[PDB]
From Swiss-Prot:
Domain remark from Swiss-Prot or TrEMBL: DXXLL motif is required for a proper endocytosis and retrograde transport to the trans-Golgi network, as well as for regulation of lysosomal degradation. The transmembrane domain is necessary for its activity. It determines its late Golgi localization and access to its substrate, APP.
Reaction catalysis annotation: Broad endopeptidase specificity. Cleaves Glu-Val-Asn-Leu-|-Asp-Ala-Glu-Phe in the Swedish variant of Alzheimer's amyloid precursor protein
Modification after translation, per record: N-Glycosylated. Addition of a bisecting N-acetylglucosamine by MGAT3 blocks lysosomal targeting, further degradation and is required for maintaining stability under stress conditions.
Alphabetical keyword list: Acetylation, Aspartyl protease, Cell membrane, Cell projection, Cytoplasmic vesicle, Disulfide bond, Endoplasmic reticulum, Endosome, Glycoprotein, Golgi apparatus, Hydrolase, Isopeptide bond, Lipoprotein, Lysosome, Membrane, Palmitate, Phosphoprotein, Protease, Signal, Transmembrane, Transmembrane helix, Ubl conjugation, Zymogen
The gene coding this protein: BACE1
Recorded consequence of changing D32N: Decreases beta-cleaved soluble APP production
Domain Peptidase A1 span(s) in chain numbering: 14-340
EC number annotated for this UniProt entry: 3.4.23.46
Protein name from the UniProt record: Beta-secretase 1
GO biological process, one term: amyloid-beta formation
Location (main, coarse): membrane
Residues that bear N6-acetyllysine: K65, K199, K203, K209, K223, K224, K231
Activity regulation (UniProt): Inhibited by RTN3 and RTN4.
Length: 370
């Protein structure tokens, strides 16, 4: 009953239905493995269809404390409290959880996104104001019998809480360690484009850190890695020349509807650290994943795309365009992240996204930046 419980607009995140307060107030909530605060619009906003009305909830308790969260994109401020929360198409349990009532925001809410709040599924260490603010999922596990694990299939999509749904993937699940419980931090040991190694010290791939983040759209890479990746993708696709603005992820590239030259763009392989010494596996991404379609009736004689790999100064972010087409298991109990090929990945008659291994490495260097 939990399958297909996610919806979204491409590039604007995936959300699940929740209710807050007594009696229940229904809100759509973006599912974000890249942060740790549960926050909802709680005052009118031009982009909000509805908002949390605390005065209508008898179970709301005010914590008398402000809170501010600045993301990579957007920021909000609000007031902390607790209230009862349920997930109509998730586990059938109700829990009292911390809630940030958003009273002011900047470039956070998105016009036409259909969500009104955000659910930070990461660990308390990155919660604001500090790590004493118990995140939602921790409250859920403490207060119910739900196993300490959830999984995401981003396609619509599914968030499965408490277990793994085999109907949602094919082949084997491969696991990489959660290096530290704050973000869902992982370690990338190798990157290949078109099968060719980028040939960098593997610590470069994880400077400052590397995270798995359903709340970010792009694959974001450290400057040095990004520039190397772009050079290699340009080389592979050199039969066509695009404006610099495209590689900067600023402007679109368009082709006559139906004629996107997928075959001229390379596959990208990210090798993740395995659970055993010097073993790894790879996840492979097709251009259908990293060239993000931009819907616009005005340009609809064409198919137009943005380049959804972009530069970061805060480490690697494996965002939605990496997670789409994979079934991703956040196995908190065993401190590991699993990847498998999703039942709903996008590909063609020539190439298919994959999760595969094992791969061994002779060089024993720790790829963690520290
Ligand atoms: C889905 C919308 N598209 C996005 C969203 C975000 C982004 O910053 N997402 C946030 C939250 C968010 C979710 C939805 C809307 C707005 C914010 C996520 O928590 C960051 N994790 C990491 C993080 C970073 C900083 C602070 C935190 C903290 F923990 F919350 F404090 C977390 C970056 C994008 N970018 C930017 C350029 C490339 C790209 O794809 C595109």
């Amino acid at each position: 009953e939990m399958v297909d419980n996610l919806r979204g607009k491409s590039g604007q995140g995936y959300y699940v239905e929740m209710t807050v307060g007594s009696p229940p107030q229904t809100l759509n909530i973006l599912v974000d493995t890249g942060s740790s605060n549960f926050a909802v619009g709680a005052a009118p906003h031009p982009f909000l269809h509805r908002y949390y009305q605390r005065q209508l909830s008898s179970t709301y308790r005010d914590l008398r404390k402000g809170v501010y969260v600045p993301y990579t994109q957007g920021k909000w401020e609000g007031e902390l409290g607790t209230d009862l929360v349920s997930i109509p198409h998730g586990p059938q349990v109700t829990v009292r959880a911390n809630i940030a009532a958003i009273t002011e925001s900047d470039k956070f809410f998105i016009q036409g996104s259909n969500w009104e709040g955000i659910l930070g599924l990461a660990y308390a260490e990155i919660a604001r104001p500090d790590d004493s603010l118990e995140p939602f999922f921790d409250s859920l596990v403490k207060q119910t019998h739900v196993p300490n694990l959830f999984s995401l299939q981003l396609c619509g999509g599914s968030m499965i809480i408490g277990g793994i749904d085999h109907s949602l993937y094919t082949g084997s699940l491969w696991y990489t360690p959660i290096r530290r419980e704050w973000y869902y931090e992982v370690i990338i040991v190798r990157v290949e484009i078109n099968g060719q190694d980028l040939k960098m010290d593997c610590k470069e791939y994880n400077y400052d850190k590397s995270i798995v983040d359903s709340g970010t759209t792009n694959l974001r890479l450290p400057k040095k890695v990004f520039e190397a990746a772009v050079k290699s993708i340009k080389a592979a696709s050199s039969t066509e020349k695009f404006p610099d603005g495209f590689w900067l992820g600023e402007q679109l590239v368009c082709w006559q509807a139906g004629t996107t030259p997928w075959n001229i763009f390379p596959v990208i392989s990210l090798y993740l650290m395995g659970e055993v010494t010097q073993q790894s596996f790879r996840i492979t991404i097709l251009p259908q994943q990293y060239l993000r379609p931009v819907e616009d009736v005005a340009t609809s004689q064409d198919d137009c795309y943005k380049f959804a790999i972009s530069q970061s100064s805060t480490g690697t972010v494996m965002g939605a365009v990496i997670m789409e087409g994979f079934y991703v298991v956040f196995d908190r109990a065993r401190k590991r992240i699993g990847f498998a090929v999703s039942a709903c990945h996008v590909h063609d008659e020539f190439r298919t996204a994959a999760v595969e291994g094992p791969f061994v490495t002779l060089d024993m260097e720790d790829c963690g930046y520290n």
